[PDB]
Amino acid sequence: GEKCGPPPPIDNGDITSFLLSVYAPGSSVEYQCQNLYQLEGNNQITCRNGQWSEPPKCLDPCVISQEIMEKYNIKLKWTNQQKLYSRTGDIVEFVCKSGYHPTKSHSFRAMCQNGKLVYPSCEE
Incomplete structure (x- = not known):
């Protein structure tokens, strides 16, 4: 469908908002890395036609x-x-x-x- 499920996890990081089970199309969530880890790539993902865009990585x-x-x-x-x-x-x-x-x-x-x-x- 158009709505997304939960955003994907990333090692040593997490989303900045409270986790929902279902997101409206066009919804965006952002990631933050654990203390000492460095965010690489766009920290924001968007729900489009039932799928999330690619999440960033956290560098060690x-x-x-x-x-x-x-x-x-x-x-x-x-x-x-x-x-x-x-x-x-x-x-x-x-x-x-x-x-x-x-x-x-x-x-x-x-x-x-x-x-x-x-x-x-x-x-x-």
Whole structure:
């Protein structure tokens, strides 16, 4: 028919209004992501001829790894400020641990991307 059923769920997010079982044609609902998750795509969906348009995605934060930093002889540039969780799109800055020198492996200015963070490394 013309009316829609409940809007689809999204991982780590939800709609901003109270869930109904049935929606009028032309109805719109919007999504919000969980604390630390980042909305990607149009946050709004619309009911047209009994079907919802495509919902957005929620991009994962990165967890800063003490073990990976220890492995690669690096440390945070700002140890006093760094939160355990980094939102997608945030930049994490590293430096060498004392008595270590940078390798040409990866940038020391790393961007968090959907749970993935590329760590630089230092040697000797």
